[PDB]
Design a protein around this ligand. Structure first.
Ligand SMILES: *[C@@H]1O[C@H](CO)[C@@H](O[C@@H]2O[C@H](CO)[C@@H](O[C@@H]3O[C@H](CO[C@H]4O[C@H](CO)[C@@H](O)[C@H](O)[C@@H]4O)[C@@H](O)[C@H](O[C@H]4O[C@H](CO)[C@@H](O)[C@H](O)[C@@H]4O)[C@@H]3O)[C@H](O)[C@H]2NC(C)=O)[C@H](O)[C@H]1NC(C)=O
Ligand SMILES: *[C@@H]1O[C@H](CO)[C@@H](O[C@@H]2O[C@H](CO)[C@@H](O[C@@H]3O[C@H](CO[C@H]4O[C@H](CO)[C@@H](O)[C@H](O)[C@@H]4O)[C@@H](O)[C@H](O[C@H]4O[C@H](CO)[C@@H](O)[C@H](O)[C@@H]4O)[C@@H]3O)[C@H](O)[C@H]2NC(C)=O)[C@H](O)[C@H]1NC(C)=O
Ligand SMILES: *[C@@H]1O[C@H](CO)[C@@H](O[C@@H]2O[C@H](CO)[C@@H](O[C@@H]3O[C@H](CO)[C@@H](O)[C@H](O[C@H]4O[C@H](CO)[C@@H](O)[C@H](O)[C@@H]4O)[C@@H]3O)[C@H](O)[C@H]2NC(C)=O)[C@H](O)[C@H]1NC(C)=O
Ligand SMILES: *[C@@H]1O[C@H](CO)[C@@H](O[C@@H]2O[C@H](CO)[C@@H](O[C@@H]3O[C@H](CO)[C@@H](O)[C@H](O[C@H]4O[C@H](CO)[C@@H](O)[C@H](O)[C@@H]4O)[C@@H]3O)[C@H](O)[C@H]2NC(C)=O)[C@H](O)[C@H]1NC(C)=O
Ligand SMILES: O=C(O)CC[C@H](NC(=O)N[C@@H](CCCC(=O)NCc1ccc(F)cc1)C(=O)O)C(=O)O
Ligand SMILES: O=C(O)CC[C@H](NC(=O)N[C@@H](CCCC(=O)NCc1ccc(F)cc1)C(=O)O)C(=O)O
Ligand SMILES: *[C@@H]1O[C@H](CO)[C@@H](O[C@@H]2O[C@H](CO)[C@@H](O)[C@H](O)[C@H]2NC(C)=O)[C@H](O)[C@H]1NC(C)=O
Ligand SMILES: *[C@@H]1O[C@H](CO)[C@@H](O[C@@H]2O[C@H](CO)[C@@H](O)[C@H](O)[C@H]2NC(C)=O)[C@H](O)[C@H]1NC(C)=O
Ligand SMILES: *[C@@H]1O[C@H](CO)[C@@H](O[C@@H]2O[C@H](CO)[C@@H](O)[C@H](O)[C@H]2NC(C)=O)[C@H](O)[C@H]1NC(C)=O
Ligand SMILES: *[C@@H]1O[C@H](CO)[C@@H](O[C@@H]2O[C@H](CO)[C@@H](O)[C@H](O)[C@H]2NC(C)=O)[C@H](O)[C@H]1NC(C)=O
Ligand SMILES: *[C@@H]1O[C@H](CO)[C@@H](O[C@@H]2O[C@H](CO)[C@@H](O)[C@H](O)[C@H]2NC(C)=O)[C@H](O)[C@H]1NC(C)=O
Ligand SMILES: *[C@@H]1O[C@H](CO)[C@@H](O[C@@H]2O[C@H](CO)[C@@H](O)[C@H](O)[C@H]2NC(C)=O)[C@H](O)[C@H]1NC(C)=O
Ligand SMILES: *[C@@H]1O[C@H](CO)[C@@H](O)[C@H](O)[C@H]1NC(C)=O
Ligand SMILES: *[C@@H]1O[C@H](CO)[C@@H](O)[C@H](O)[C@H]1NC(C)=O
Ligand SMILES: *[C@@H]1O[C@H](CO)[C@@H](O)[C@H](O)[C@H]1NC(C)=O
Ligand SMILES: *[C@@H]1O[C@H](CO)[C@@H](O)[C@H](O)[C@H]1NC(C)=O
Ligand SMILES: [Ca+2]
Ligand SMILES: [Ca+2]
Ligand SMILES: [Cl-]
Ligand SMILES: [Cl-]
Ligand SMILES: [Zn+2]
Ligand SMILES: [Zn+2]
Ligand SMILES: [Zn+2]
Ligand SMILES: [Zn+2]
Lengths: 692, 692
């Protein structure tokens, strides 16, 4: 028959392997000819696989590239202005790729140009709390200094924002072996660790969901009216550049001034990790000089959009999307994901050629310019927002399929928890020691829920991937899944030249069994979402998490009992709303199970109630100063785009509140955010009441 | 049978008459006990009439009232500070009501307190062009002056905003007989004209759609967090008070300074209409002094919400709403409308008691605090916005049923033009000379379309009534209809104490036949919208008007050919989008007529495409500095809230552009607005394409 088992059985590890190899032989940098050619290949193949239509959707967006004839680098300069040490111009290419052209050298995308010269301050991970420690406790002033920060813990854009607000005149980012060199494993090509010449690329924007910096709100189409650079969204004001740990050792070894405040500031290099400012006595007249000459340029990008029309509800869309652009070869990021999408499309197309169609429409997307700020997905969603918010059932992301070989990692809306539990109980575990056991069993054993015995950990969605527009702007139920390691600082070869097909085939997944498991999870979710008669969402799971999040935010506020008394700060309305949501969801669930199953209008009313429940958490006014983060329950952390924050409006109103000069105003804003949250939870609850 | 004819035949003129009398014996001022009692009566009666549920929805909103022991008035003061002339403390009450208590004296709701003293400047209607003439041509400076303006032409809130920006320190509004005294008709009680002691009440806010000044975006519920007065939306900064023409004559007769610039500045009083500043020689040391002591106060209001659940699509709402609060007796405004709603509810309830239900759910609303800024409807819509934007089919307004006895007046979305033409062809004309002819025929004869022979005039929706939140904020197809006069300056007794039951019964509609015709139009529209299998919207009518509006806005821009050349200002994208909309709408219409009629999912997809088409013109970012005006095609005029403006974003970008100091910036913003409009029209068109 044509059921989920038939779909799942058609997926093959060997096909994923072939596609991965096919997608990783040359670089596919956004805006380059090679990535346009790959888009055309994928379009052709998806048509051959049997999709009903496959189109390219293009946009002209702001991208950033080094200058090929004026390379970026950092120096130590002596008192005469002689450059006595220079950082590398490129990563040593891996074996057999030493003649591959168009490898973009390491750079921080969207850095402005400049040649700032100054004294170094070491700022640990450049987190908000690292800057609090420097200014408030250590009394070190970063104003007019070049700061050097280790990658890790938080999104690099947040590091740069934090350095800017501290008054830094430039930022040097580096990979410390503490964070990117696993003990006991060899450097690439003999293992999966970062060599000392390896460097992590990546953008340093602070877009807060806007998409293309020049066209916030609207697609960057042929007639778009663009902001000037000075009014663009999210661009950094100071130069930034990334280096490897051989080069970092040379910049850090001479550092003087104050000692590190404790061991959480020390990485693994043989240097003191002194904070500065500047170098020790003998070298005190030497300085550090950056040379950044990259340019921002409006450049065409191409999304591939494939459609498999639904047989019964063609006006309901289930979306499987992931990006295609890579920094270099994209062996893990994104092609391990893209190869999985390709095999999922192939399997659905096999069923379609035998006469099957899903109940609802499935859309497949190969996004461009993700690496430059989620630009392809965001512009497309901006173009199609009306269609998406009235018809969008769900979005399943499909970036990297693997970041390790230990167990499953799932982040998603509470509406999908039951779907994920049920699906993983029907899938085979690929893990050694769990032969003949379910994926649910292996996952639950290796990654136990911190709340509930006998359940696996599922995390809330953060950001830094292409679901952002769909979930946090538009309120479409979203999820993601991949294979991960044991225990936000990525795998060692992340965004480096060393992330190749061979990395994956030799060290991560030689049999492609973890890739296949991830294909089954992502594809199985899509199948259920697109074919189940009743949408596979459980509103009661939202009720449970809303109480947890309400308890959490109340607990934060209750660190300030005197102020809560003075300003009459009550969470009673939020708990009331959460109680009401719990009650109404329970009653809706009863009707969903008991409704007349012959009546397709009651079913669709029910299905629309389910689809629009995630939508109900959207506030059209957005969060404060972040108009494109509209979901009231979930936003990316203001301190780390990768991490999700719950009740973000209240959280940010409470953050560091003891430091605000006007407590009356600050606690007034806490109360305002409690009102907005309680109202939104109640309003979402009421969408599940009987309709009339 | 149970069809529209049965519904229409049940409506009775004599019932409307009885309800009107019942609703107009005492004042029903928002926030007063008498208006709460009327709300409870209507709730009880709607339940008895047969609605499924009838609830009160209350909110606590900012209202404004005079101080009963510290009355508002204006003086002429001589050089010693003696008050030699005082304006009236109240309107002479009409016959038989001279002992009625709680008649609110004339005042401008939301005026701040103050006692400003100064020289008068007469500013005609206080329109934007009147202030342009004073400053730019006549070189008269209103800074620190008290301005005196005649009511008429534009919403009084716009007059006050314009006076404030001119630097006025107070505003006196008056009714000139040129605008409020029809030649040949007697003053009330012997005819329908305004007596010299009559005064027009009304609010002077500039809310731009916000609702309650203290809670923009969110309902003013029990736990709402309120702005402080200083941050409230829309409040005037200078005192304002309204007077009648006996009192105005006393203030105007001594005016000196400059002569009126032409005859369009002269009303009908026996005064010169000199502009000032100040009085002529003998009286030059005299001044005008206002005394305003009204207070703003958070006050409970009550909407009545009745539900008639749909038999087939109970999750689709057709709304019939109008306000209940009045300034005094509300003989026309609003009770002529409320009485019509009451009889419509009664007629639907009669059918329901015989076993009928409409296909879709009908909601009936008696709104409160309309007179204080559309507060009741707006707060309710804020509370229920998620339900409304996913389920709202249409909103039919029901304020005053009559403002004259000449012919029909209809303002509505283009989506309802065909519905209105078809319905009025099936209704009998009530007009003398058209016995046995259709309402369509009489209306078309008396109010010909300026574009098309053999069609009647239908206008675009402006604002100043309770449809605003539904149409311009939420994008729900809306309409209104009433009987009107031959040829924005209301009927003479508007918002005066003289607007009584007797006014209506003696002078406007003694047989209640015009009321009955309006009940048939409003009720018939609701019936069709709630019962037609395919929603009765024609998307092709939107295509026709979008071309008209595009031609209009292009024509405005083409008054500046040199600038369009310099800044490369093209409307090509907007015309392209309109062409595309026209083509796609034509194809959708073919499918709507040709689709398989047995398939309820294709029908609902079609019905959802129809319902969401008005929704597609909404921009979640709003218009510039007016976040609650979100419709890109239609907004209230920035110069006159009562008037609708098409392509408002482009219109306001072009307005007075020749006066802007930075033409590059100004024309850049024109181009931005063209892009937003072209994009929105294309996006709306694409919602009518095949869905997959
Ligand atoms: C969780 O869900 C529950 C419902 O089970 C909601 O309960 C409502 O809670 C509010 C309190 O926040 C109640 O509001 C009160 O309404 C009274 C009038 O209620 C009657 O009339 C209304 C219509 O006008 C009907 O809908 C209702 O059924 C009743 O018949 C007011 O008189 C109250 O105001 C008085 O007391 C307050 C507080 O002391 C004073 O501030 C006022 O000045 C005034 O003296 C009050 O407004 C409401 O009745 C409850 N509805 C119910 C039980 O159906 C919760 O609100 C909801 N949680 C959230 C966060 O929404
Ligand atoms: C009204 O509806 C029509 C459709 O009937 C829309 O037409 C589109 O118009 C735009 C122009 O604004 C066209 O854009 C052009 O696309 C070319 C590529 O098209 C092919 O590939 C795409 C996918 O990538 C397919 O969708 C398409 O079917 C074609 O196969 C580009 O090469 C063009 O760019 C080049 O020329 C321009 C202008 O000189 C330069 O600025 C560029 O730098 C570049 O050299 C251009 O982008 C689009 O193809 C049309 N689609 C069609 C016919 O299907 C109208 O846009 C629409 N009106 C509005 C307001 O939306
Ligand atoms: C994940 O899997 C779980 C476990 O299967 C699943 O929960 C189960 O869902 C079914 C179907 O809704 C539940 O069965 C219902 O239970 C009630 C009470 O026993 C019955 O009244 C229902 O009967 C009606 O519907 C039947 C068809 O479903 C008709 O045959 C019948 O005539 C009635 O109309 C029905 O049997 C079952 O109770 C739960 N089990 C739980 C919660 O433990 C869950 O839904 C899955 N999650 C997702 C997202 O799919
Ligand atoms: C206002 O009134 C006008 C005038 O009645 C009305 O326009 C008419 O609508 C009908 C119904 O859509 C149109 O009739 C259709 O015309 C085409 C071509 O002739 C036919 O193919 C259609 O046949 C299909 O549908 C029928 C049922 O409607 C089935 O019986 C049949 O098997 C087919 O499936 C159908 O007859 C008619 O052409 C227009 N007339 C015009 C435009 O002059 C208009 O819709 C009304 N407006 C509103 C808002 O209700
Ligand atoms: O501009 C942006 O917003 C991000 C662009 C780019 N995005 C990424 O590289 N994202 C990777 C980096 C991983 C970061 C992370 O903290 N992931 C957490 C996570 C949790 C559960 C999963 F299933 C998958 C990932 C990713 O999402 O795979 C970047 O950070 O440079
Ligand atoms: O605060 C506000 O936005 C308005 C409150 C109040 N609103 C009204 O009194 N509105 C009346 C005044 C009539 C103004 C007008 O220009 N009406 C035009 C019009 C056109 C077609 C119709 F079917 C009905 C009215 C009404 O809409 O009936 C007011 O102006 O003081
Ligand atoms: C990746 O696979 C594609 C598809 O098999 C290859 O592209 C095809 O190459 C052959 C031989 O040059 C052509 O005849 C076909 O027209 C191509 N088909 C397409 C683009 O759909 C491509 O060569 C492979 N790339 C690598 C690096 O192996
Ligand atoms: C990239 O760097 C090159 C080399 O410095 C820039 O090309 C030079 O530009 C200047 C004027 O801007 C000319 O006078 C030189 O003759 C050019 N040099 C060479 C070797 O061609 C180029 O402008 C930069 N590219 C950018 C900014 O995109
Ligand atoms: C670091 O790189 C710089 C730039 O290439 C080198 O400095 C240049 O050296 C050449 C030849 O000696 C001079 O003609 C240039 O004027 C220098 N340019 C600048 C900007 O200083 C420098 O020698 C390199 N340092 C090391 C240690 O390799
Ligand atoms: C308006 O009509 C209502 C309804 O007929 C009248 O209210 C009723 O009055 C009688 C006699 O006092 C009471 O017994 C009923 O309980 C009332 N019914 C309600 C409120 O539903 C009211 O008297 C009329 N008002 C005027 C001014 O005539
Ligand atoms: C309305 O006006 C009255 C009368 O002027 C105000 O009442 C007076 O208030 C002052 C102090 O604010 C007292 O000292 C007087 O004795 C009061 N006079 C009387 C006659 O009671 C009243 O405050 C005003 N109401 C408002 C602002 O709502
Ligand atoms: C206009 O009204 C004011 C206020 O009532 C009158 O002025 C008051 O007159 C009484 C009695 O003569 C004095 O005790 C008060 O001091 C006056 N108050 C003020 C504020 O001036 C005035 O007489 C009235 N003018 C006319 C022409 O009737
Ligand atoms: C940091 O240094 C600059 C002066 O170079 C100064 O403007 C700023 O206020 C300093 N902050 C301190 C010392 O806290
Ligand atoms: C694969 O799993 C083995 C066994 O647990 C482990 O030793 C190895 O480090 C893993 N490889 C990667 C790349 O994580
Ligand atoms: C209007 O009058 C005031 C001075 O009383 C002044 O501030 C303002 O600039 C004047 N404008 C003119 C004369 O245009
Ligand atoms: C009613 O109609 C008659 C006849 O046209 C007209 O003379 C009279 O002024 C109308 N009454 C009102 C209040 O408009
Ligand atoms: Ca954009
Ligand atoms: Ca509000
Ligand atoms: Cl992912
Ligand atoms: Cl109306
Ligand atoms: Zn990626
Ligand atoms: Zn990446
Ligand atoms: Zn009214
Ligand atoms: Zn009114």
């Amino acid at each position: 028959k044509h059921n989920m088992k038939a779909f799942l059985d058609e997926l093959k590890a060997e096909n994923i392997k072939k596609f991965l190899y096919n997608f990783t032989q040359i670089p596919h940098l956004a805006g380059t000819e090679q990535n346009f050619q790959l888009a055309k290949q994928i379009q052709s193949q998806w048509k051959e696989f049997g999709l009903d239509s496959v189109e390219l959707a293009h946009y002209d967006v702001l991208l950033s590239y080094p200058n090929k004839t004026h390379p970026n680098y950092i120096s130590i300069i002596n008192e005469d202005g002689n450059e006595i040490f220079n950082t590398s111009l490129f990563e040593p290419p891996p074996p057999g790729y030493e003649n591959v052209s168009d490898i973009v050298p390491p750079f921080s995308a969207f850095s402005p140009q400049g040649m700032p010269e100054g004294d170094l301050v070491y700022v640990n991970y450049a987190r908000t709390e690292d800057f609090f420690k420097l200014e408030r406790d250590m009394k070190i002033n970063c104003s007019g200094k070049i700061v050097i920060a280790r990658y890790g813990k938080v999104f690099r854009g947040n590091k740069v924002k934090n350095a800017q607000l501290a008054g830094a005149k430039g930022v040097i980012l580096y990979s410390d072996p503490a964070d990117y060199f696993a003990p006991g494993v060899k450097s690439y090509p003999d293992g999966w660790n970062l060599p000392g010449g390896g460097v992590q690329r990546g953008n340093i924007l602070n877009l807060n969901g806007a998409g293309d910096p020049l066209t916030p709100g609207y697609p960057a189409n042929e007639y778009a009216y663009r902001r000037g650079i000075a009014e663009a969204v999210g661009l950094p004001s100071i130069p930034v550049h990334p280096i490897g740990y051989y080069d970092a050792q040379k910049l850090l070894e001479k550092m003087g001034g104050s000692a590190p405040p404790d061991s959480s500031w020390r990485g693994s290099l043989k240097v003191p990790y002194n904070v500065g400012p500047g170098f020790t006595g003998n070298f005190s007249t030497q300085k550090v000089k950056m040379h950044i000459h990259s340019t921002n340029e409006v450049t065409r990008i191409y999304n591939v959009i494939g459609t498999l029309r639904g047989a019964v509800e063609p006006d309901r869309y289930v979306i499987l999307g992931g990006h295609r652009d890579s920094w270099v070869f994209g062996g893990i990021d994104p092609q391990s994901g893209a190869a999985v999408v390709h095999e999922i499309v192939r399997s659905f197309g096999t069923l379609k050629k035998e006469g099957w169609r899903p109940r609802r429409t499935i859309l497949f997307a190969s996004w461009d310019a993700m690496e430059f700020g989620l630009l392809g997905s965001t512009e497309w969603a901006e173009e199609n927002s009306r269609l998406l918010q009235e018809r969008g059932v769900a979005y399943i992301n499909a970036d990297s399929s693997i970041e390790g070989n230990y167990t499953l990692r799932v982040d998603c809306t509470p509406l999908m928890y039951s779907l994920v539990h049920n699906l993983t109980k029907e899938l085979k575990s690929p893990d050694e020691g769990f032969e003949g056991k379910s994926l649910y069993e292996s996952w639950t054993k290796k990654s136990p829920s911190p709340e509930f015995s006998g359940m696996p950990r599922i995390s809330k969605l953060g950001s830094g991937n292409d679901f952002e527009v769909f979930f946090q702007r538009l309120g479409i139920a979203s999820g993601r899944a991949r294979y991960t390691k044991n225990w936000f600082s990525g795998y060692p070869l992340y965004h480096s030249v060393y992330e190749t097909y061979e990395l994956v085939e030799k060290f991560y997944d030689p049999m492609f069994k973890y890739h296949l498991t991830v294909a089954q999870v992502r594809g199985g979710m899509v199948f259920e979402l697109a074919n189940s008669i009743v949408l596979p969402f459980d509103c009661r799971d939202y009720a449970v998490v809303l109480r947890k999040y309400a308890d959490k935010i109340y607990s934060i506020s209750m660190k300030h009992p005197q102020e809560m008394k003075t300003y009459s700060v009550s969470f009673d309305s939020l708990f009331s709303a959460v109680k009401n949501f719990t009650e109404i969801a329970s009653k809706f669930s009863e009707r969903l199970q008991d409704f007349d199953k012959s009546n397709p209008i009651v079913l669709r009313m029910m299905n629309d109630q389910l689809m629009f429940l995630e939508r109900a958490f959207i506030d059209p006014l957005g969060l404060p100063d972040r108009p494109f983060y509209r979901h009231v329950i979930y936003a990316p952390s203001s301190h780390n785009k990768y991490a999700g924050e719950s009740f973000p409006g209240i959280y940010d109103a409470l953050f560091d509140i003891e430091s605000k000069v006007d407590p009356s105003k600050a606690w007034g804003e806490v109360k305002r955010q409690i009102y907005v949250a309680a109202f939104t939870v109640q309003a979402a609850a009421e969408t599940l009441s009987e309709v009339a």
